[PDB]
Amino acid sequence: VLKDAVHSHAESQKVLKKVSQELQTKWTDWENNRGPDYLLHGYRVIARALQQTYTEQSMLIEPVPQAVTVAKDAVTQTVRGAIKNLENPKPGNDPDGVLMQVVISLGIEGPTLDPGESIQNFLETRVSDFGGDDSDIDYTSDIARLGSALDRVRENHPNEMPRIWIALARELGAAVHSHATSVRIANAGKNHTRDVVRMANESSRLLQGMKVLSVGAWANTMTVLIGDLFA
């Protein structure tokens, strides 16, 4: 390589760990001290990232196999399950957000995953990440249906994946907005929209920089933020 780029890669590795640590210290201070505003800034960042995959994947769109229609049906079914688990649980269960946390991770991170990792492996990894291995609900059939439908499309015709990301991102973005207003109204008298907007802009510029530097590092930091949302 150029000597020059090899030196810049090391400098980038150092900047990357500094930004990750600064993000997590900012978020721990904000969650600790700024209460509900922290959660609302979280939803704002998540909504922005979903809008990002919505627009970028919309740019990529240039007969369409049945596997695509099956994948679209699997994402609506699974997102429905995620929201039901979170906001209208069965009699005898408590609200559970991990399925929502994993499908949001998929909407945000899925388009930039390495081809070598299957969607099914991604989903299982993030169920583990969000503490879902010790839970009350079985996510097995939900994540199975999503993972198999999406991996069928990703193996047979990856160039068709945008149609799925688009539909996933759009629906999730709407669900986030609806849910954010519920949290916001629940905290009437304590909301500071100026601080939410500022916090969301700081977080987003640091996360976007991190994403250009290392998509896996960005995805792990995003996992931390998403873990604080959806109860």
Numbering used by the authors: 11 to 72, 79 to 247
From the manuscript:
To elucidate how SemD functions at the molecular level, we determined the 3D structure of the protein, N-terminally truncated up to and including the APH motif (SemDΔAPH67-382) at a resolution of 2.1 Å. The resulting structure revealed that the C-terminal portion of SemDΔAPH (aa 138-382) folds into a rigid core, consisting of nine α-helices, which is N-terminally flanked by a long intrinsically disordered region (IDR, aa 67-137). Owing to its flexibility, the latter is not visible in the electron density. The proline-rich domains (PRD1 and PRD2) are within the IDR and provide a highly flexible interaction surface. Within the electron density, the amino acids are clearly visible, except for the connecting loop between helices 2 and 3, which is presumably flexible; here, the side-chains were not included in the final model. Furthermore, electrostatic analysis of the rigid core of SemD revealed a large, negatively charged patch on the front of the protein and a smaller positively charged patch on the back. We found that SemDΔAPH is a monomer in solution and the p(r) function indicated a globular core – corresponding to the helical core domain revealed by the X-ray structure – and an elongated tail. Based on the information derived from SAXS data, we added the missing N-terminal residues (aa 67-137) to complete the SemDΔAPH structure. Helices α1 and α2 of SemD’s rigid core carry the two predicted WH2 sequences essential for G-actin binding. Our SemD structure implies that WH2_1 on α-helix 1 is largely available for interaction with G-actin, while WH2_2 on α-helix 2 is not fully accessible, suggesting that WH2_1 might constitute the G-actin binding domain.
